[PDB]
Every structure is written in C-alpha cells, then in structure tokens.
Amino acid sequence: TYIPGRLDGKVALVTGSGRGIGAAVAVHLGRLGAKVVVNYANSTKDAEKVVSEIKALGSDAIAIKADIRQVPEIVKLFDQAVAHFGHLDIAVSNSGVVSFGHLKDVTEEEFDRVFSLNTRGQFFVAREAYRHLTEGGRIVLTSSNTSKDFSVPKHSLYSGSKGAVDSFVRIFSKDCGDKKITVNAVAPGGTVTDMFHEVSHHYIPNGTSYTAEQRQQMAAHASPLHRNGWPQDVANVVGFLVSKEGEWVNGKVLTLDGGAA
Amino acid sequence: TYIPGRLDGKVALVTGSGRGIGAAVAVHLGRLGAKVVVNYANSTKDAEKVVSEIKALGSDAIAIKADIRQVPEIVKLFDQAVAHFGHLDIAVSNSGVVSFGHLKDVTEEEFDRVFSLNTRGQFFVAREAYRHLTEGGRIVLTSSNTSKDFSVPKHSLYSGSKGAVDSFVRIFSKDCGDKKITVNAVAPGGTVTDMFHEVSHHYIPNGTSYTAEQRQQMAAHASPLHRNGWPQDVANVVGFLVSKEGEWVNGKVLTLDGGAA
Ligand SMILES: NC(=O)c1ccc[n+]([C@@H]2O[C@H](COP(=O)([O-])OP(=O)(O)OC[C@H]3O[C@@H](n4cnc5c(N)ncnc54)[C@H](OP(=O)(O)O)[C@@H]3O)[C@@H](O)[C@H]2O)c1
Ligand SMILES: NC(=O)c1ccc[n+]([C@@H]2O[C@H](COP(=O)([O-])OP(=O)(O)OC[C@H]3O[C@@H](n4cnc5c(N)ncnc54)[C@H](OP(=O)(O)O)[C@@H]3O)[C@@H](O)[C@H]2O)c1
Secondary structure: OOOOOOOOOOEEEEOOOOOHHHHHHHHHHHHOOOEEEEEEOOOHHHHHHHHHHHHHOOOOEEEEEOOOOOHHHHHHHHHHHHHHHOOOOEEEOOOOOOOOOOHHHOOHHHHHHHHHHHHHHHHHHHHHHHHHOOOOOEEEEEOOHHHHOOOOOOOHHHHHHHHHHHHHHHHHHHHHHHHOOEEEEEEEOOEOOHHHHHHHHHOOOOOOOOOHHHHHHHHHOOOOOOOOEOHHHHHHHHHHHOOHHHOOOOOOEEEEOOOOO | OOOOOOOOOOEEEEOOOOOHHHHHHHHHHHHOOOEEEEEEOOOHHHHHHHHHHHHHOOOOEEEEEOOOOOHHHHHHHHHHHHHHHOOOOEEEOOOOOOOOOOHHHOOHHHHHHHHHHHHHHHHHHHHHHHHHOOOOOEEEEEOOOOOOOOOOOOOHHHHHHHHHHHHHHHHHHHHHHHHOOEEEEEEEOOEOOHHHHHHHHHOOOOOOOOOHHHHHHHHOOOOOOOOOEOHHHHHHHHHHHOOHHHOOOOOOEEEEOOOOO
C-alpha cells in the first residue's frame, strides 16, 4: 500500500510560518512526517500555536524568531535549526509583504521595505539553505501570479520583487545541483490570508465600494473552479515539490491560482 | 513635415551613454533627429565624444553627470534635462553592471552593488521619467536574455536583477498609460562591449583556454545568423520602440539575441 510524499526522517524550515500561507505549509509538512522549524518575526503566540499543532499530529517543531530582512539573523536562524534538529533537508522561503502605489508615488523607503524582504531576504534564505542543507534537499521560494501571469495597476514594486525570485530559482537550480538540491518557487494567486483581505480591493475596478465578503466572493470567480485559493492549496503543492516524487520538478515556478490565468 | 521613424523635435535621455550600448543608443537617437541628454557616472571624456558625435550629425546634446544608484541624482538629472531643453519626451534606462558567482559565495555587498543600479536605479529612473515626461512619451529599460531566455550557472544575482525589470515594465505600462507613455524593455543577449569581455567565458561550452577575441568568435555562433550582437543592434530596436510607429509595443520585453534562444 504505497503512500506517496512522506517526509519521515526529514527536517524542514519555513520562514514566516506563524500565520497565513507559511503556517499551513508548516503544519502540512509536519503532517507529512517532517520535523519543522517555525520561523517568525513578530507573531510569537501565533507561531507557538503552529508548533503546538504540529506536535499534536505526532511530529516535532520549534518556533525560532528571526527578521529575514537581516542577513546575519538568517545565518543564525539556520545555525539554530541544525544545532537543534541535527540536520536540515527542506527550506521554504515564504515571508513577504505586499505593496500598492502608482509608480509616480513610490518612495525609496517603500522600494526598500519590499525588496529587503521579498527579494533580498529570499535570496539569502536560499544561500543559507544551500550552505546548511543535506545532499538531496529541497528549496522552495515564494513568488506570485503578479510576477508574470497577472497585471494589476499600481502593483509594479511588488510584481517586480517576485519577478526577481522567478529568475533566481531557475539559476539557483544550476548552482544547487552540485549538492543534488532542487530549487523551485510557488507563485500563488489570490490566497485567503491577512495579506489578501488587506489588498483585495485592487483586484477589482475601484473595489472599495464592496464589503470584504463581496470582494472575497468576487475573487473566488477568478478560477474556473469557482472557489478561492487557500493556504492549504499552496501547502499541498509545496509538500509535493519537497517530496522524493517532486525531484524532476527543478528550477521551475508553479503558478497556483486554480486555473485563473 | 513629419518623417516616419524619425524623432525630429523630440528630446531623449539615455543613462550611462558615455560608452557601451548606451553610447550607441544615444548617437542613434541623435541621428534620428532627437536632442540628447548623455548621462554618465565616471566616463567624462567618453561622454563628451558622444555629445560631439551627436552635434556632428546635425543634432544637439549635453552630457550630465549623475550616479544612477543615487535617487536624488536621478531627480537632478531629469530636472536639468527639462531645464536645459525645455521638455523631455524619451527616457532610456541603460546603465548596468554584470556579476558572476555561485549562490553560496554571494555577499550582501555584491547583492546590493548589483541591485542598487540594475533594479532599484532603473525603477527610479522610470519614476522620474514619468514625473518629467511629456504626454505621449516613451520609457525603455534594459533587461537581459539571462532574465528568462538563457540560463547560466553562477549568474543568479544578475539574472534576478533583470527579472525584476521584466515585471516592472509590464506594470509600468499600466500606470504610465495615464500620460499615454509607453514602457518597454530591451533584453540583449551577448553584445560586444566592455561588459561582454569580462564574462564571455561563462557563455561558451569550454572556453577556458581562450582569450577575449577567441571567446568572442565562439560566441558569434549562438545566433543562427553566426555573428555577435552589437550596441547598434540594441540602438536599432530602441529607435523603433521610441518612435511614433512603435506605440503598439507597450509593456513588453524584447529579447535581442539574433535568434539564439
Ligand atoms: N496571500 C496572497 O493572496 C498571496 C498571493 C501571492 C503571493 N503571496 C506570497 O505568499 C507569501 C505568504 O503570504 P501571506 O498571504 O501568508 O502573507 P501574510 O498573511 O501577510 O503573512 C505574512 C508572513 O510574513 C512574515 N513576515 C513578515 N515580515 C517578516 C520578516 N521581516 N521576517 C520574517 N518573517 C516576516 C509574517 O510573520 P510575522 O507576523 O511574525 O511578521 C507572516 O507569517 C508571501 O511571500 C506573499 O508575497 C501571497
Ligand atoms: N553587453 C552585454 O552582453 C549585455 C547583455 C545583456 C544585458 N546588458 C545590459 O545592457 C546595459 C548596458 O551594458 P553595456 O554592455 O553597455 O555595459 P558596459 O560596457 O559595462 O557599460 C556600462 C554603462 O553603465 C554606466 N554606469 C555604470 N555605473 C553607473 C552608475 N552608477 N550610474 C550611472 N551609470 C553607470 C557606465 O557609465 P560610466 O563608465 O560613466 O560609469 C557605462 O556607460 C546594462 O544594463 C547591461 O546589464 C548587456
């Protein structure tokens, strides 16, 4: 009785896994048999619930605080992971922030706020993952449908931040091959989280004239499956990418929008 | 009387047009009838020769020093352009630096060196272009075949800096449409300049024992036309994009590699 995609004996790290997509990814990898490093920057209590949830399904996990904007903290995060669990096999770079603004109004401060986490942060999470990971490991970064597949006015900064990631993973796969580590990205479409409700009004003309429920309902019709994307959808795909069965998917960006594009 | 393809009565600015691709673009736009702002960071003499060349073919030009890494100098550059010529119609963002290195070895310093110019710099050149341009104007940024079309080991940092640019211009076209300004990028393949010779050993099978000239000869075979790309090849395409007749190409990235991909 073959059960595919188990991660028994494996150790995974997920950045920003206290809440949102990261949280569901972390719990799912735990459910699949992996021990999990739950990284957070702010959401201490949320991260501890995630740790508790993973332990409850019969795995093990630890919540570690690190600001992914700070490269020395990324280094420390990965050293702590290895010192605690003994090895690290899977690294999922998930932390990101969203941004909207007409090009004409984008400040230096906002450019840097976004790129420092979404692009620079993810680049050095991948570097540190390469440095710490066991042979035959897995690195997954997080892009967006807005990188290439979906054009939203006033969304250039954020779209660009993930466009860089798409290019990163393709070349990362070449470099990381010398340790047989695969490197991919997931590019979610609208996925129901704190970030989604924060900006749902942009995926519609005007959009501020609807309730959060109406906007969510309207977003559900983007997919021909007529439902919203959920953190579990992303987790399902990350789970496969980081499994043994996922190996021949390498250097690729998978847009996870339920067929919207 | 308007002449099709020409740029008579227009004012153009090219970043880093003292040498390399920028210089060819700047001279070509001058040849097409545009008055030209020739930006440089270091190459004073080269920039002045560019200015003289544009004057020799019956147009006008001024060289203006500005470090494109510095957003306040971009502002200054565009301010001076508008003060000097009365208006600015065309902005070409060309300045860039190359980088190679395995992911594992990439430093904070190198990441920032590359992104501050290639990505952040170009983003803010686009912001200042929008801010200063006449209605119906043109903005072109510079990407690379390595963004999406060509994978080179140890080239993740630079490849990603241009992948951001690809996504930027697609969305910039939406924002800038409210002034009828088109925004595109050119994505050169290997193009014979100082930059090409620094890195051409990465582009060919095993070119270790080969001097610059031999590496260039070998790289000439990537294109099914069996020649190298030249700065004039890029200038030729820029000249069309920034013309009236180029209007319906908007929000796009054109890979200019003579058919190699
Ligand atoms: N949800 C969508 O519709 C959507 C669509 C496309 C792409 N994405 C991408 O999917 C990823 C997750 O999005 P989400 O919807 O789950 O976002 P979210 O609900 O806003 O959650 C953000 C996550 O990022 C973490 N984080 C923020 N700043 C951090 C920092 N400096 N260092 C470390 N972690 C930090 C947060 O942890 P703390 O609370 O501890 O700060 C939190 O866990 C992001 O990369 C996002 O760009 C989301
Ligand atoms: N050549 C290729 O094979 C190739 C391939 C793909 C993409 N590209 C892209 O095409 C563009 C031009 O490349 P190229 O081959 O002409 O490069 P190059 O020969 O190295 O020339 C670089 C140009 O950028 C300018 N520059 C450098 N730093 C600057 C700064 N801080 N501020 C303002 N300007 C600065 C330089 O001016 P100063 O001398 O005054 O510093 C110079 O004019 C770049 O964006 C490059 O990434 C080139």
